């Protein structure tokens, strides 16, 4: 150790190089690297000097590597590296003649930027995004693609989100990168895109205009949950936008894909997200709702609303209820023919107060259609009221006149007064 600190501070390149390699090796260990202990040895500022030794690309590389391993540590370890001015240097190193140095500068910058939004915004401020995207072309080796994408994803990560104007140029690169077959690149790219599509519809506008939609729908069927999860997030974000933005996704047969996500034995978290995604499509027009009906999603949807875990039931209710909101008279009768009345009634006693309002709202839209059929047939009774009554739904609503919440209170009264006088 005292020979390490010394050679680092020496004038001899041999001494300098061995010591840095040793420190690097010291910091390169897998189980609890001695990061606190390499900083308090006072070589960190000397490591930052070695980064500028363009004549000694090996020392640069080794120094950048030890600095990277230091910045993988605690928030403080990262704040020390920043304070010694390494951020602009690593960005300058992205223009290195050496490929090992450029790849390491990327990994370093990803580590600093991964620390916090604060650190992310400084790395972006030192102009790291533009020299980063220039390292990506038709000849970029896989190791660098993994490094660069993981870094690009971290530049985008974080709450509050970075300016969209700052992260926008990275969109063309990410749009290419999702065409890779490498799981790691596909993983980080989709996470990166899931961050950029999260926000206002003009952000979603930028994302679909970059042309990612077809490939994203394919990644729904990726065998790895590591790729499916961020891809499902992105696709879900896109369909929270308008009808036309939602259409870019529907156009590439995503509904049959989402259908299979609910049917195969997958994690609750995944099934829950496909349903939230499905809910934002039945939150669309009569034809987007028709696109869902056509794929055969209602059938399985109802089954989930009836028998699935409550984190899934919550989202299946929203899908079903939203469909009654924008749907036609006939589509709505199809939802009832698939047997959605009973599963909607059963949730009027769930402890989640928002859900109860959603089912109640969905049940009322069913009631209005049944009311129109009662007039068209000049009948005595609303057929759908009889079904709601049959599902023990009439008694639940009668009891919701006892609810503590005014939103729920006023709607139960409204429903009973409009359909049960």
């Amino acid at each position: 150790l005292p020979a390490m600190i010394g050679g680092v501070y020496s004038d001899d390149n041999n001494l300098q190089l061995e010591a840095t390699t040793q420190f690097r090796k010291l910091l390169s260990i897998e189980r609890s690297p001695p990061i606190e202990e390499v900083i308090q040895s006072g070589v960190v500022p000397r490591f930052v000097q070695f980064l500028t030794r363009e004549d000694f690309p090996q020392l640069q590389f080794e120094a950048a590597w030890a600095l990277t391993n230091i910045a993988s540590g605690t928030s403080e370890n990262t704040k020390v590296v920043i304070d010694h001015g390494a951020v602009p240097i690593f960005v300058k190193l992205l223009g290195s003649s050496s490929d090992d140095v450029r790849e390491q500068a990327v990994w370093a910058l990803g580590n600093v930027a991964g620390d916090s939004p604060k650190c992310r915004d400084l790395v972006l401020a030192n102009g790291a995004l533009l020299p980063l995207l220039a390292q990506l072309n038709e000849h970029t080796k896989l190791s660098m693609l993994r490094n660069a994408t993981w870094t690009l994803s971290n530049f985008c990560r974080g709450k509050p989100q970075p300016s969209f104007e700052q992260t926008r140029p990275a969109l063309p690169a990410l749009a290419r990168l999702i065409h890779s077959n490498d799981e790691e690149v596909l993983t980080d790219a989709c996470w990166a895109l899931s961050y950029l599509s999260d926000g206002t519809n003009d952000k979603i506008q930028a994302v679909i205009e970059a042309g990612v939609c077809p490939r994203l729908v394919e990644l729904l069927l990726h065998p790895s949950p590591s790729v499916l999860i961020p891809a499902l997030r992105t696709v879900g974000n896109i369909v929270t936008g308008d009808d036309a933005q939602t259409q870019c996704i529907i156009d590439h047969q995503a509904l049959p894909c989402l259908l299979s996500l609910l049917t195969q034995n997958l994690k609750k978290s995944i099934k829950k997200e496909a349903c939230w995604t499905i809910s934002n499509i039945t939150a669309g027009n009569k034809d987007q709702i028709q696109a869902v009906i056509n794929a055969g999603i209602i059938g399985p949807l109802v089954n989930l609303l009836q028998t699935a875990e409550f984190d899934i039931k919550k989202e299946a209710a929203w899908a079903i209820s939203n469909a009654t909101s924008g749907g036609s008279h006939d589509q709505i009768k199809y939802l009832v023919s698939e047997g959605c009345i009973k599963p909607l009634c059963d949730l009027l006693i769930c402890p989640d107060i928002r859900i109860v309002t959603v089912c109640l709202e969905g049940l009322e839209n069913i009631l209005k259609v049944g009311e129109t059929d009662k007039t068209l047939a000049a009948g005595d009774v609303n057929v759908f009221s009889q079904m709601i009554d049959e599902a023990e739904g009439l008694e639940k609503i009668e009891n919701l006149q006892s609810h503590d919440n005014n939103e729920i209170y006023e709607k139960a009264v409204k429903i009973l007064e409009a359909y049960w006088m």
Binding site: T240, A283, W318, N322, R354
Partner: peptide
């Protein structure tokens, strides 16, 4: 009023 799109 309750039903619609969700971010």
């Amino acid at each position: 009023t309750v039903l619609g799109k969700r971010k």
